[PDB]
Amino acid sequence: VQFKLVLVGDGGTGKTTFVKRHLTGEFEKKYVATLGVEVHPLVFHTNRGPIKFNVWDTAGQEKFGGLRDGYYIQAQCAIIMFDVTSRVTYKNVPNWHRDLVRVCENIPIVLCGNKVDIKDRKVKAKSIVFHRKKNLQYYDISAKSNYNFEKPFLWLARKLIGDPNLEFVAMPALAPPEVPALAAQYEHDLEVAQTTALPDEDDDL
Amino acid sequence: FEPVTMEEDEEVLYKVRAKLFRFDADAKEWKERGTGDCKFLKNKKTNKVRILMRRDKTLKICANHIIAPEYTLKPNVGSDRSWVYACTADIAEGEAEAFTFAIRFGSKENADKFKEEFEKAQEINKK
Amino acid sequence: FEMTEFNQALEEI
Amino acid sequence: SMEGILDFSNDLDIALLDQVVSTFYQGSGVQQKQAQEILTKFQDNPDAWQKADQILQFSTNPQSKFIALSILDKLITRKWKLLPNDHRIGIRNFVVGMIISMCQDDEVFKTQKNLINKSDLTLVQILKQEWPQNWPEFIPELIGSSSSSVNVCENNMIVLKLLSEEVFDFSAEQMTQAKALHLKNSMSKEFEQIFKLCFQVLEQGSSSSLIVATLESLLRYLHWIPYRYIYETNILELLSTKFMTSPDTRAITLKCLTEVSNLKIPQDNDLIKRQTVLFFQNTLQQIATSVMPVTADLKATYANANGNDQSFLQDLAMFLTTYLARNRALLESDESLRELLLNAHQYLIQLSKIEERELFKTTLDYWHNLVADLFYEPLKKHIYEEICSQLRLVIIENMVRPEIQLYKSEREVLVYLTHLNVIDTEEIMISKLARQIDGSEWSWHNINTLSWAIGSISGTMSEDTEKRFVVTVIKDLLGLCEQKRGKDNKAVVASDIMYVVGQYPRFLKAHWNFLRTVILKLFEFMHETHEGVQDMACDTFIKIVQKCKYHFVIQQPRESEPFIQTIIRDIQKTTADLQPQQVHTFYKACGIIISEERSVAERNRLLSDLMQLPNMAWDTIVEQSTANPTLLLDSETVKIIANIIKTNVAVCTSMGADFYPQLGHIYYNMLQLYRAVSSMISAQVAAEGLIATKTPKVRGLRTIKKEILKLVETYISKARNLDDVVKVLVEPLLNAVLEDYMNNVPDARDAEVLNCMTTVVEKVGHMIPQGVILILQSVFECTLDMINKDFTEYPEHRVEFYKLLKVINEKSFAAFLELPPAAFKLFVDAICWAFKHNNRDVEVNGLQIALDLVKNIERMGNVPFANEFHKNYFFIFVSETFFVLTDSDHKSGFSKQALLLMKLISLVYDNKISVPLYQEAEVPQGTSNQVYLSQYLANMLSNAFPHLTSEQIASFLSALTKQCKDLVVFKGTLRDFLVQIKEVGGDPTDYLFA
Ligand SMILES: Nc1nc2c(ncn2[C@@H]2O[C@H](COP(=O)(O)OP(=O)(O)NP(=O)(O)O)[C@@H](O)[C@H]2O)c(=O)[nH]1
Ligand SMILES: [Cl-]
Ligand SMILES: [Cl-]
Ligand SMILES: [Mg+2]
Ligand SMILES: [Zn+2]
């Protein structure tokens, strides 16, 4: 019960960060450009059983483009990403959409405007209208603040499964087990942990 | 006329909003694991207390382990509202694994209260 | 959350 | 083993290729990842295209053939004109032949749409290179071949669709202006034949897949073709009737008719007006009979999400709004067209009920267009009276939380709708409120929504009507609060009551006794422990004050003193249970009121009384803190100090220039505190290392420093008496902050220092030239060394740094003139360094500083410094600007790059650079800078872009330099150049386009 999802958009828009957040829960501060594509299985628990997304996180930089539209073949859904702090990335949305629907003529697509956590927003809400005539679902999102970070997958799940009432549900929590010569090993690793400051100490949580 | 989650066997001792970190020693870096409600759950049969924490919206488990009496909460150098401690068996991602966790709270007050409840729970697992 | 003061001020016009 | 295909010395094993491809697409894990890197290396091979014929012939894997076409695509796009002429013909015939064969095989044509569509796109790339000048018979032969086979005909429609897209929709910034115009004219010249084919297919039927492909191509044509093809034929009849019946063609047809509504059409032809009415009438007819009636519940339909219903209803909304926004006037006069007009709008009402944010915004934009028109246009609103009445309910029931864009849009429409009929609006809202009381529509969300709606129309009714309305609403809400039980339910209602009153300041202003009771109640709520109430109380308090401040500062008839005095007397009691942030908002609100007192002696007295608590706490700290500097280690003392300063920031924010007396009260001791705190931070970093900066102890200390800087910045940015700023504030400030910043280690330096200095230079920079010099000396070099190793580290310092250089360059350029030559060199390096940032906060300032710098130098005239500047740095700026223009990694700054370059080039061609920019050795004596500039640039581009011909470079520069007075054209030429550097064999005559 798995679906191929292609994730496209300009370099630096936060595609890989967004996926990483969903995979591990981490927020990657550094920008390490994706080379070609990285495939990441991503499973969600729903009232209609588990749904698996094979996320093809593609490269946004042209010099690292790889197979480019070759990555889109037999994709069953997609996310187009841009950056609300960078107008040029929205200006290129029509280009990504073009290359996408030429290979995938009839698939559910979500348009995502990322980084709405940043104060000085450049791509204003009222000017974001490209999705209208193309029947794309649109969401403001932030991989950093997790604003609407689940909406794209929830909407895509509902379309692919064909149930508008599909909901994410709590996965079963098994009873954890109870618990040598490695009392020195953990004390070493723990000493380093205490003396390494937690990130973003100014955040609300 | 004829008409037309494996945790409901437990008791919620303590609940608090928190952000959980795991320490990646290879990179010497704290990585976020999840944000949401951190719960102390007491099994009504065994009376053993565990930590269960889920991510908001997705509700995916980001912490699941017994509050062992062997564990010790330490302060982090850069925070007055967090605790650091080693975990030897967490089954959030599946198979039992050991982690060095850090959990941060909304305030020093919630942090101190957490440690109070944490040690209370340890005494219960101590039987 | 009682607000008897509000009514009294409203009825005063 | 998979890496065998990467060996081109041996024959390519097609079987091995397909395995690598399958391992990538259908495989997983490490094998997939390894295959991925192998495939990329394969297609990236500049000789891979030669082995494309093999793959397309001998392969059985469609994905392998797809990748083969991608390799070809890359060749055609970039190196086509470099190939031998024989290879060009060979590739062409191979692609045509491949397409023909796939069309003749019904099995392949049916099961490999992807490979065919890719082959078609590849053909289109060839056409963009070869057609029509070297392929004049393409369209004739295309039309001919279409009559023989249905499959070929359908595929030709796909080719023509793709062709139209590449030429008209996506040609900008992908081909030169000359190339685009050439292809546009070519398609334009032969479209008569294409339309004939198109119309015949549509009229004669009958293959669904063929009709749809034809309509899909028609959608693209409508973007550019002249209106006559649509109105002087029967095609509107076919679209608006025949094709609206079948769901297969319905979707695409509706999109065509939407674009038809956007066609350029003469507004004087009465016959064309009837044709425009007619196809609308037909379309709405088919929808009512074949899809759903006007009474249908589209909300429910959309929710069920059966089939393509959601896309259809989206498209219907777009069609109705597009047509009606432009043509509804055509339906408003003729009485026989009234039913049509209102049915169309009734569909829009039903669409507006759908639960879908982005769809609602689409319809709401139309509703705004309508009610705005009814508000101004005579004799119109009576037509839409029943539509507007329904709309009022729809908008009220879907009102969103104000905090924002959607709310403001909803507010505007609802305000218009209230003007159009105040009576009906009031009735709906009261009725809605009654259903909150009887519990039939009671919920936390529903009462909040209604409250926001009721609050949004304030100031639209008459004052007397508003008064009657407000009173009725508050009474009803008051009674609703008593009705409920439990604090949770009571809290929601109580908050809404406070929200509404806060939205009707005109009412509060007219009734002091009530206003007083409101404020007094808010003060009571500031003690309420229930979550959210205290925040609500403070936010409402300051909100009311902002609008009614005058009624707090004057003596009311039934009062002994201005109410502001009463608030201050009990301020300790009132705010005792508030969090620090909430207290600061309270003080800020008091400052707003005090600022309205125009009697200076009274204002200062109120200010002193307001700041009584923080000043006493402050005085006690300064005594204890200096006597025992160890006190500052105490986190509690640090927190107290921070909150005192924050209170001063809060009041200063609302009082601005009036805050000066309070500033002077604390100023000298505050800067002494700044120094003492600075020492401790340094001492802590020395004893514990850099990690100390991460500790709560030091972060607490740095907060004090940051808040002090913020307070000074806040005042100076709003100061009216700049003489006092200069003669009292600046010197102690600089002595307190500059050396401390310079002599701290990088991780201990506060970026807020740079920000504060930016404001100082901004407001009084012209009056302290010695001061500005001192600022540069203390922060310039040491900050630059922090940020000039990479683009990531010290992001805040990075942004503030260039904001500071910018204002100094604007206000006190003399400071840079006083720099030693070595330091001025770093200044130039710093500016170019800013060009190369992707971070737009840095990039834009970098370019602006560069532009303003050139201008500053220019105003100096013919003097030694200006002359030495050009000799040293002119060609550095020209080349650095060119680099970011052409490296494809700074496209965000194109406009400002172009402007800077144009300014640089204009200096020479206006002879504003007196001295020669060259050595007497490299160029004969007497050569103008104009000629030397061309040589330098010609040589620079030749080495940077060796695949360009000398003719291209010469033509480009010839065009660029003579267009250096016209920015739009200049930019066009640059964009043409950016296209040509991406390929080989670009036409140099393209630069003669203007
Ligand atoms: N403030 C903020 N930063 C974000 C957000 N999402 C991503 N970033 C940051 O953007 C930068 C690039 O992230 P990245 O995931 O690599 O983008 P990308 O689209 O995958 N780049 P590429 O296409 O080249 O692989 C990172 O520094 C990341 O921290 C966000 O939501 N808010
Ligand atoms: Cl549309
Ligand atoms: Cl909605
Ligand atoms: Mg990436
Ligand atoms: Zn056509």
Residue numbers in the entry:
A (entry chain A): 9 to 187, 191 to 216
B (entry chain B): 65 to 68, 78 to 200
C (entry chain D): 391 to 403
D (entry chain C): 0 to 376, 414 to 439, 462 to 1052
Task: Reproduce, without paraphrasing, sentences from the article in which this PDB structure was first reported.
The exportin CRM1 (Chromosome Region Maintenance 1 protein; also known as exportin 1 or XPO1) is the most prominent nuclear export receptor in the cell. CRM1 recognizes its protein cargos through 8–15 residue long nuclear export signals (NESs) in the proteins. The NES-binding groove of CRM1, which is wide at one end and narrow at the other end, consists of 5 hydrophobic pockets P0–P4 and is virtually identical in all CRM1-NES structures. The resulting CRM1* construct, with ScCRM1 residues 1–1058, Δ377–413, V441D and groove residues 537DLTVK541 mutated to GLCEQ (to mimic human CRM1), binds NES peptides in the presence of RanGTP and RanBP1.
Selenomethionine hRio2NES peptide was also generated and anomalous data were collected to confirm correct placement of its methionine, and unambiguously confirm the direction of the NES polypeptide chain. The CRM1-bound hRio2NES and CPEB4NES structures unexpectedly revealed that both NESs bound the CRM1 groove in opposite orientation (termed the minus direction) compared to previous NES structures (PKINES, SNUPNNES, and RevNES bind in the plus direction). The structures show that the two minus NESs clearly match the consensus pattern Φ1XΦ2XXXΦ3XXΦ4XXΦ5, which is the reverse of the class 1a pattern, Φ0XXΦ1XXΦ2XXXΦ3XΦ4. The five hydrophobic residues of the hRio2NES and CPEB4NES, designated Φ1–Φ5, bind the same P0–P4 pockets as the plus NESs, but in reverse order, with Φ1 in P4 and Φ5 in P0. The hRio2NES and CPEB4NES are in fact not class 3 NESs in the traditional sense, as the four previously designated Φ residues in hRio2NES (389RSFEMTEFNQALEEI403) and the CPEB4NES (379RTFDMHSLESSLIDI393; predicted Φ1–Φ4 positions are underlined) do not occupy the P1–P4 hydrophobic pockets as predicted. F391 of hRio2NES and F381 of CPEB4NES, which we had previously missed as consensus residues, are the Φ1 positions of the N-terminal ΦXΦ motif of an inverted class 1a pattern. In both the hRio2NES and CPEB4NES, large hydrophobic residues in the Φ1 (phenylalanines) and the Φ2 (methionines) positions within the extended segments enable a longer reach into the comparatively distal P3 and P4 CRM1 pockets. Mutagenesis of the Φ1 and Φ2 positions of hRio2NES and pull-down assays with CRM1 and Ran show that large hydrophobic side chains such as leucine, methionine, phenylalanine, and tryptophan are preferred in both positions. Wild-type NESs MBP-hRio2NES and MBP-CPEB4NES bind CRM1 with KDs of 2200 nM and 590 nM, respectively.
